Design a binder for this molecule. Structure first.
Ligand SMILES: Cn1c(=O)n(CC(F)(F)F)c(=O)c2cc([N+](=O)[O-])c(C(=O)C3=C(O)CCCC3=O)cc21
Ligand SMILES: Cn1c(=O)n(CC(F)(F)F)c(=O)c2cc([N+](=O)[O-])c(C(=O)C3=C(O)CCCC3=O)cc21
Ligand SMILES: [Co+2]
Ligand SMILES: [Co+2]
Lengths: 381, 381
């Protein structure tokens, strides 16, 4: 059931912004680890005395990494005279965010036809304003509302080069890395109580519940009209035998915030080969391997979609596989991206539901919870 | 002239500790960029609820990267019951250091025979105590005094595995990277006024002035008895045509602090080939190239130490070369290690002064200031 209730028109994810203490080191780690090119900068070299911001891109995926400079470099400025390229930026907000959460996502930015209307409609429907709409170089409008915790939903609209004031990175300082990652598929929040969080976000966006088909979670997925923009939210299930991963998140994150980013690959086998190659030389580690019992039940589940060679390839790379009403989902999770057991990344590829591919094809892997529990018992046999 | 006036016995540099906001991302960037292996950890996985600390090693070089967790994980602890592996660590001090300076060096640690005596003698000779001596697991003693700015000089002594409470990193999660870097050669501070800084540090250590043989600097080098431990200090020269790099440092760093770490390589050609290979895929960038006039005057200076093949190799890699009373110095500088124009790294190899090699052999490149100025004029001809 898709009522198509978006209160303003939404296109697609535009970028994800990380708030960090050093944007250079995080951006270079992520670039090597995920195979993303350095494509735009805004910093001292471009006349930005406020923040350093570096953009990495892979296909349509845009990761922005931003950290503050000493406030003393911009003490003479006022908001109208600012040299920040992201006018919503605030030294104290950024410093307070990082000291509270460590490295994490500050803004989930979606592109809209009209960011000012998006902001107005949103707030008129209960969104908590975070930063009012501001027109950038007569070309781009940016506005922010609170999403959950200290994460904001950033609206971006273009009248017609990432953002004004950013410069393209020099050819020599930009290496054409690519491991097959192509776009952001969904962005997931962890909150203490799912009900109020869903009601708030569904309330100001018009996004509808997407619906799926023990685990330490309960969750729901909000989606835009074409279900391209997918924003799931998790809450803990207390009292379970194993402590809820969501509860561990909330404790180490100091409250609600973004849990994982799921990135679509055009070739999850190539992506995981390239990323695993680099795990111990600066890249990302992956979740522990599932038992062989899991991969010895994979043919009886998905053998109609993937060859026995590809199923062996899944056991080598640790890929998990689940099946929807409509399609198949290949998926794997990284270990946390930084010091804290908080944010992590999911790599995915979905097979099926072609019209282009419809969003959410295959679901989010809900069945892998019970399939992994069984193989755990079956292996100890 | 070496009076050998050390007030307590000093052996060698033990480690350099970086204070960061995320220790994972910085440590993985540095590991790939410099070719250093992950060798020890102290973090949640080892029962440290206070800080995450990761040690990288190359030859004798030890870089430690430390960031704080949420204070809430250790709210129930007191100093006697702490789970920190570095008892000098303080959440507020670390958070305040990083927000003030960004990524930078907190501790220059030197090994001594008796860290408690080192601390006592030091303070009795004017050192400002930073953290009193503390015996770790009946095996290791650690103590800290102020060095300059918010940088401390950390004394370490062993009765007889980096530090107690650290664990060796698992074989799979530790990749044998090595680009030829072998040990720390010197660590340089930038201060607003050299005189008072020298008097303070020379005052509590007994270190003697090492002495060398326009530039926006004036500087002096303090050295231990065998001149292995080398601690130069810079101050700005105001009024020069080009603004002093030291003054730019002090403004962006919010005051005095560590400017550069010079790392000895056993093969500076191999090191710079490996590091430059990785500049645009997560590693470190290097200083701009000198003109060819510089390398067209290199034979008439050092042609007795390096072949014309090696001199061509210097022009390819951008290596600079200077000559002492006693030896030859090969050297090159990175661009700053993080967002701010503050800390950077120097790679060096020295040729000569063999007895082992005596410390400081070749100097620190003082002549390259006037050799580079000339080649600049000669190239515009
Ligand atoms: C498939 N799957 C899984 O098998 N396990 C067990 C494993 F593999 F770790 F052992 C997970 O723990 C796991 C955790 C998460 N999560 O979001 O925390 C997700 C996930 O992506 C997801 C969403 O995107 C929105 C709806 C909620 C949801 O579950 C999937 C998971
Ligand atoms: C050799 N040399 C140089 O040629 N230039 C010009 C170039 F190349 F950048 F264009 C420098 O700027 C430069 C800067 C520094 N510094 O410390 O800032 C040092 C250096 O290492 C040093 C010490 O270790 C202790 C004593 C002070 C001192 O000068 C060497 C440099
Ligand atoms: Co997911
Ligand atoms: Co030097």
């Amino acid at each position: 059931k898709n009522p198509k209730s978006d209160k303003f028109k939404v296109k697609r994810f535009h970028h994800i912004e990380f708030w960090c203490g050093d944007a250079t080191n995080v951006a270079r780690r992520f670039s090597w680890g995920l195979g993303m090119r350095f494509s735009a900068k805004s910093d001292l070299s471009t006349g930005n005395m406020v923040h350093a911001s570096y953009l990495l891109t892979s296909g349509d995926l845009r990761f922005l990494f931003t950290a503050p400079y000493s406030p003393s470099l911009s003490a003479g400025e006022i908001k109208p005279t600012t040299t920040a390229s992201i006018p919503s930026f605030d030294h104290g907000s950024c410093r307070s965010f990082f000291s509270s959460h460590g490295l994490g996502v500050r803004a989930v930015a979606i592109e809209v036809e009209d960011a000012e209307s998006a902001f107005s409609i949103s707030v008129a429907n209960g969104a908590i304003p975070s930063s009012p709409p501001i027109v950038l170089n007569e070309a781009v409008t940016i506005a922010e509302v609170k999403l959950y915790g200290d994460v904001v939903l950033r609206y971006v609209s273009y009248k017609a080069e990432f953002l004004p004031g950013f410069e393209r990175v020099e050819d020599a300082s930009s290496f054409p890395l690519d491991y097959g990652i192509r776009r952001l598929d969904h962005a997931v929040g962890n909150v203490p109580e799912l009900g109020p969080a869903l009601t708030y976000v569904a309330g100001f966006t018009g996004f509808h519940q997407f619906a799926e088909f023990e685990s330490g979670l309960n969750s729901a997925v909000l989606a835009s009209n074409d279900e391209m923009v997918l924003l799931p939210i998790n809450e803990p299930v207390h009292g379970t035998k194993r402590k809820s991963q969501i509860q561990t998140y909330l404790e180490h994150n100091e409250g609600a915030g973004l849990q994982h980013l799921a990135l679509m690959s055009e070739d999850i086998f190539r992506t995981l080969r390239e990323m695993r190659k680099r795990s111990s030389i600066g890249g990302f580690d992956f979740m522990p391997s599932p038992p062989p019992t899991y991969y010895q039940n994979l043919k009886k589940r998905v053998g109609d979609v993937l060859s026995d060679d590809q199923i062996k390839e899944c056991e080598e790379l640790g890929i998990l596989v689940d099946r929807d009403d409509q399609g198949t989902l290949l998926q794997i999770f990284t270990k946390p991206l930084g010091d804290r057991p908080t944010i992590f990344i999911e790599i995915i590829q979905r097979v099926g539901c072609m019209m282009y591919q419809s969003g959410g094809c295959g679901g989010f892997g809900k069945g892998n919870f019970s399939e992994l529990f069984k193989s755990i018992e079956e292996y100890e046999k």
